[PDB]
Amino acid sequence: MPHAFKPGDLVFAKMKGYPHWPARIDDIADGAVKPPPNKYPIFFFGTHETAFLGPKDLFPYDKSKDKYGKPNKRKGFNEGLWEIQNNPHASYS
Ligand SMILES: Nc1ccc(CNCc2cncc(Br)c2)cc1
16 A cells, blocks of 8 residues: 655656656655645656645655656756666765
């Protein structure tokens, strides 16, 4: 059965203006800014940016990869697809 999102979970994350984007649930460092209520730090593969999103915008990776994993022209997208498929838990900073 599913659980609440935890650090390391792999998703596609949706933001307005962008296709569903390969991402992971990140940890919160000490003293860093914490997310708003019921939001999570989302690390976007490829672009290597982080945003706070809620679960309604987070789609578990294996269930959604057939629908959202197709290559496209957006900057960083294809590299993000490679990262989530080949080394999704590595350090990209
Ligand atoms: N605070 C904040 C504002 C906007 C952005 C969107 N940046 C472009 C982008 C990069 N990777 C994945 C996607 Br989807 C979109 C991110 C964070």
